[PDB]
Structure 1
Amino acid sequence: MDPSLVLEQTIQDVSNLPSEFRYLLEEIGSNDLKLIEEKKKYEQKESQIHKFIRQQGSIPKHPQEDGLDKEIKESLLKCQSLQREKCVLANTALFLIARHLNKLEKNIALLEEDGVLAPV
């Protein structure tokens, strides 16, 4: 057990992690741009239904209610897939750093069980 060996091992295992966080976070931002533009594509079609109700109510039917509802549901469901992809990306960045943090915390505990490791 040697802190310089654990330090070498931890550095090498985390050497590409700063490059990986950028690759993941910029894939979330590129998908969040696709999300917002798709929000305008359904929030506008949803504004047409709500404006009709604000004047006449729900009992009267919008001239193209069945036509817009198919377009809102389709635009809303594709937004879900785009958001699920951003979740997976964010979870991997969390998973990688947490696993390396646990590996380091397990080695620190082993160094503390001996006399090798100095306190804080």
Structure 2
Amino acid sequence: MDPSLVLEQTIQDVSNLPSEFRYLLEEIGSNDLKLIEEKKKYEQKESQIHKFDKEIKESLLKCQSLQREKCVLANTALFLIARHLNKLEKNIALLEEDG
């Protein structure tokens, strides 16, 4: 009864994990907002050179501000999958004690 009944708690723990992955659907849906804006932020940089200083030096504030919002979805996507993954093998280590 020891290497069997704990598998039911594995079910309920990763139960909200696809809904957690459904929260990533907003997060990967958030890449529609800014990576297309990444295509559209380019139009005020190369078109303003024009066969060669407030638009060349201070233009980094339009670039440095955008890298903050991409990171919250990035690394947090990993560790949730890790606790979707890695905690099973400690229970498998209980299952490895028998067949």
Q: Which has the higher helix share?
A: 1
TM norm structure 2:
0.69
Relative contact order, CA 8 A, sep 6+: which one is greater? Answer: 2
Rg larger in structure: 1
SS at match of 1:83: coil
Contact 1:38 1:75 in 2 (8 A): no
Deviations 1:9-38 (A, max 9, x none): 111011111111121232243244234225
Cα offset for 1:107?
0.8
Q: What RMSD in Å do the two structures reach over aligned CA positions? A: 2.9
Change (3 A) 1:41 1:101: closer
**Following superposition, which runs of at least 4 residues in structure 1 exceed 6 angstroms of deviation?**
none
CA distance in 2, matches of 1:73, 1:30: 29
SS at match of 1:114: coil
Structure 2 portions without partners, runs of 5+: none
Contact 2:10 2:88 in 1 (8 A): yes
Structure 1 portions without partners, runs of 5+: 53-68, 116-120
Kindly tell me the number of residue pairs found equivalent between the two proteins. Answer: 99
